[PDB]
Amino acid sequence: GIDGISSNESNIKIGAAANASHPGGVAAVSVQAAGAPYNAFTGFSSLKGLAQAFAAQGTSNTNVTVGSKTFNISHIPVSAMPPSHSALGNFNFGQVGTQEVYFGEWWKAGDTPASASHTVYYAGDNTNTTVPTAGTATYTVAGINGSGSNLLSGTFTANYGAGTLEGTLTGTGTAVSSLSLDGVAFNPGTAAFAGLATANGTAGIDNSGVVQGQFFGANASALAGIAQFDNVSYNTAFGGAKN
Ligand code: HEM
């Protein structure tokens, strides 16, 4: 019952957890850039535990408040993992509150988020998702773009009757300074949305963005998605909690 995707399946796939060395959780990520056994699907809640426990070795786990909503942010650098884990690279990912909804990024060991290996993804449990067919709701949304310390933040507006998702994420500490949805749409009553996006930031305006994501949870209590660009520095993952 896990849905989600990544911007580069050569590097990252999303699925259900199956990692015997780090068991636990359901929504999961696989580093396809790695060979077995290190391409196992590992639950995000398991990775969150590891990020909590290995803080003295360089991981971090932090609750970040945006408005009245909390996003739990995990940073896992390759330097904090055992030497055998070299191929696993670097992660930043967030959880939407206590919901089983995760969004994040990855890049190869020795790279930066500006490198070609920069990959963004999202994952969530769809078991009890329902999408309203009418009315409007807003979401407090956090975005990850090349940092586990500095987030993007904004408000998305879902018009469930029109099937539109609108809004902008902004922040001061990332390559992206602003990320606006453009024509992001969904069939009313269904969870999956897609559209375009524009970004501003350290490389200037970039109109090449494409967006995909979905609503999660009873009454669409959450959303998550990715925006990817010709400029991979601008690739962003996001997660939102319904206000
Ligand atoms: C990202 C996905 C991960 C995968 C696929 C993975 C995979 C594995 C595998 C296959 C083993 C057993 C073989 C070995 O020792 O290398 C293992 C052990 C271990 N892993 Fe991971 N791991 C992941 C994340 C992490 C993280 C984030 C940490 C800590 C920051 C970590 C710390 C450890 C530790 C402490 C052991 C026990 C062996 C030792 O003490 O060196 N792992 N992992």
| Beta bridge pairs of residue 62 | 73
Q: What DSSP string describes 157-218? A: EEETTTTEEEEEEE-SSSSEEEEEEEEEE--TT--EEEEEEEEEETT--EEEEEEEEEEESG
Query: Edge to edge, what strands does the sheet with 42-43 contain?
Result: 12-16, 27-31, 42-43
Q: How many Cβ atoms sit within 10 Å of the Cβ of residue 149? A: 12
Instruction: Name the closest-CA residue to atom 11, ligand 1.
Output: 21
Pair of tokens at residue 91: 């992660």
163 phi and psi angles, rounded to 5 deg:
70, 40
What resolution does the deposited structure have, in angstroms? 1.5
Angle at 111 between CA 152 and CA 81, to 5 degrees: 90
Give Cα separations from 168 to 83, 127, 199, 235 (angstroms).
40, 28, 9, 14
Helix (H, G, I), strand (E, B) or coil at 121: strand
For a ligand 1 pocket test, name from 61, 81, 92, 121 the mutation site with the most ligand atoms within 8 angstroms of its C-beta.
81
Strands (E), 77-126: 90-96, 101-107, 119-125
Q: How far is CA 94 from the centre of its chain?
A: 6
What type of residue is 68?
S
| Experimental technique of record | X-ray
- Nearest-atom number in ligand 1 for the CA of 59 is 30
Cα separation, 220 vs 202, in Å, equals 33
